[PDB]
Task: inverse folding
């Protein structure tokens, strides 16, 4: 393995993402001219805020993932004050930005991007890993406009954001592969409608709607997409299409909404123009 890298090995540029506990900055490695999204964490802050388990979890999950639809962790290093994680740079930023920019996706684009998300979850779940906070904000787009999923601090390894929270969190404080499938249902809805299905004035009211399954479809909603969303946004987590009790990804990928999809080499296909 190559030597440990250090801050002086890079020219840092613009901020790519910001949170309460870390910041992601674009960096060019001087020796190679390669660009990375370097996530920078202050050790003292992470300790004082008791976030060590989330940082450790992200580092451990993002190392293990070897699939084109995920941001990869390439290296780590530290100085006196900070931890640095070298991540895949997804040049086109968040899926959320595209939804805001174009309003809502047509059916060809909805189908393609939903298929990539499904294929990514199939990989992740096949490794016994659940994301637990999947959303358009952490589904990134690379230079070629394929997805790259990131932000793995909340991931669970098998022995979140209000709008996408599954009912089992609100009623049981629990989560399973099926929680990611609920998030998928919300995301498909948001691609088609242009807005998340559970919306309200404040977090409390959103939670109220989720536990009552209080949402509805706009008239312009692709009917096959509507049927799919209805088979994902189900209160009983064991009855969501894609979950183990529903016999997994086979029946999900076979849904009529995906009729024209070739599943085998999505990463090799040219995405539809947005
Ligand atoms: C800072 C940001 C928001 C907060 C989140 C958090 O703190 N979550 C959390 C907090 C507490 C506990 C658990 C989880 C961590 N976030 C990110 C951002 C990116 C990222 C962004 C842009 C990129 C680009 N253009 N190419 N690559 C990129 C990679 N990658 C990871 N892994 N995490």
Result:
């Amino acid at each position: 393995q190559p030597r440990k890298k250090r801050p002086e090995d890079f020219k840092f540029g613009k901020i790519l993402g910001e949170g309460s506990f870390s910041t992601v900055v674009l960096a060019r490695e001087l020796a190679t001219s390669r660009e990375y999204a370097i996530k920078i964490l202050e050790k003292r802050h992470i300790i004082k805020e008791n976030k060590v388990p989330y940082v450790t979890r992200e580092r451990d999950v993002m190392s293990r993932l070897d699939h084109p639809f995920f941001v990869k962790l390439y290296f780590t290093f530290q100085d006196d004050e900070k931890l640095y994680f070298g991540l895949s740079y997804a040049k086109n930023g968040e899926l959320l930005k595209y939804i805001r920019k174009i309003g809502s996706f047509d059916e060809t684009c909805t189908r393609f991007y939903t298929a990539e998300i499904v294929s990514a979850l199939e990989y992740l779940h096949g490794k016994g890993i659940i994301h637990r906070d999947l959303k358009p904000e952490n589904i990134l787009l690379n230079e070629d406009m394929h997805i790259q999923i990131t932000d793995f601090g909340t991931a669970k390894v098998l022995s979140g954001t209000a709008q996408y929270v599954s009912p089992e969190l609100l009623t049981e404080k629990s989560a399973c592969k099926s929680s990611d499938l609920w998030a998928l249902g919300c995301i498909i809805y948001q691609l088609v409608a242009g807005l998340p299905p559970f919306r309200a004035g404040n977090e409390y009211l959103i939670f109220q709607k989720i536990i009552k399954l209080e949402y509805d479809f706009p008239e312009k909603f692709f009917p096959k997409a509507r049927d799919l969303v209805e088979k994902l946004l189900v209160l009983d987590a064991t009855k969501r299409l894609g979950c183990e009790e529903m016999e997994g990804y086979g029946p999900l990928k076979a849904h009529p909404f995906f009729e024209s999809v070739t599943w085998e080499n999505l990463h090799q296909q040219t995405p539809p123009k947005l």
Notes: The CA atoms of residues 72 and 214 lie 37 Å apart. The chain has nine helices and nine strands.
